[model samples]
Target: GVDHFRAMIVEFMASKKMQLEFPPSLNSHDRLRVHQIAEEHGLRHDSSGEGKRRFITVSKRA
Candidate 1:
């Protein structure tokens, strides 16, 4: 399950980097999903919000 989740995020990040039409960018709901997975995997998801704009930073724990 952990591996699957990690792989999904990796694929999504790569797709976003390649500017793919599918998956698109990480929206608010998507970011929330990421945060939950990160917590389960001992990862960190930090966010900075300003008005309607939000920035996300994710990192591995340890």
Candidate 2:
């Protein structure tokens, strides 16, 4: 399961060629897990939740 998650994330990054931020459609469990993993890898987690808008932005740690 760990390898599967890592492989999927790598594949997504290579194919998309963008930041690792995932969309808001993920369930709570997935959302938290992804964020946790991103943080562990020295990434910054930013978000905006103004009104109905919500999103996650991942960037290199400062």
Candidate 3:
């Protein structure tokens, strides 16, 4: 149980940071992954809709 939580947290943090560190002109493929990370963090889905088209925006800054 603890290990699962820890692993999930680690993966989530890594994904989150990677997403945040991406350039403003990141490709749609990368953007979708970022959106997935945001969804995993229980944050709002401001990507657009779903899948690739959903992640075609500059949702995260910095």
Candidate 4:
């Protein structure tokens, strides 16, 4: 299971080749796009409610 998931992530990264960085700039459009993509993939953008731990989850597209 671990091997299969690792392979999928590697393939996904290869298909959408880009340099990932930290502390995304204020005027960085790429950052915004990345966030949108993250949301679509169930990534943690913010808390689900006013006071809660922000958590993210992703499932394989089978």
Candidate 5:
């Protein structure tokens, strides 16, 4: 079930997507995985929101 999560990351990296936004409905634990995935692939991640609007965005490190 999890193989394709990182799979999407590759698509973003390969396709030169400037950013990838996590769906707000995803739980906190999964969002943390996104952080690790971003770091593992030499990318960066950030989560920012107010109230119930939190979200994560994956992007290039440099």
Candidate 6:
């Protein structure tokens, strides 16, 4: 459950991406998982919306 989320975060950093977004279609559980994973990596993230068009924006920290 947690592994692929980790992969997406790690891969994004490695890809030198400016940022990325994921919908609640992935569901809040995994969205929370991704945010938590981003925390471990010290990356920046934000989550909000009417829970629609909602997403967590992820990027490197400092």
lDDT (10s digit) by residue, model 5, range 1-62: 25566888878888876888877765766777788888888777887678887778888754
- C-alpha RMSD for every candidate: 7.3, 3.9, 9.3, 11.0, 2.0, 2.3
lDDT of 3 by residue, 1-62 (tens): 22433354346465654232233354565556555655556534343445544333222222
Measured by TM-score, how close is model 6 to the native structure?
0.71
Ten-residue stretch with the least lDDT total in model 2: 1-10
Query: Mind giving the per-residue lDDT tens digits that candidate 6 earns over 18-50?
Result: 777866566667878878887877778786566
Sort by TM-score, best first: 5, 6, 2, 1, 3, 4
Show the lowest summed lDDT stretch of 10 residues, model 6. Answer: 47-56
Best by TM-score: 5
The true-versus-predicted C-alpha distance at residue 58 of model 5, in Å, is 0.8
Stretches off by above 4 angstroms in model 2 are 1-18
For all candidates in order, the CA lDDT equals 0.55, 0.60, 0.44, 0.38, 0.77, 0.74
Question: Which model, 3 or 5, shows the larger TM-score?
Answer: 5
Q: Pick the candidate with the highest lDDT.
A: 5
Candidate 6's C-alpha runs over 4 A off are 48-51
lDDT accuracy of residue 61 in candidate 5: 59
Question: How do all models score by TM-score?
Answer: 0.46, 0.55, 0.35, 0.31, 0.75, 0.71
| lDDT by residue for model 2 (10-58), tens | 5655565455555676567666666676667665656656766677666
Candidates by lDDT, descending order = 5, 6, 2, 1, 3, 4
**Alpha carbon deviation, residue 48, candidate 2 (Å):** 2.4
Give the count of colliding residue pairs in each prediction: 0, 0, 0, 0, 0, 1
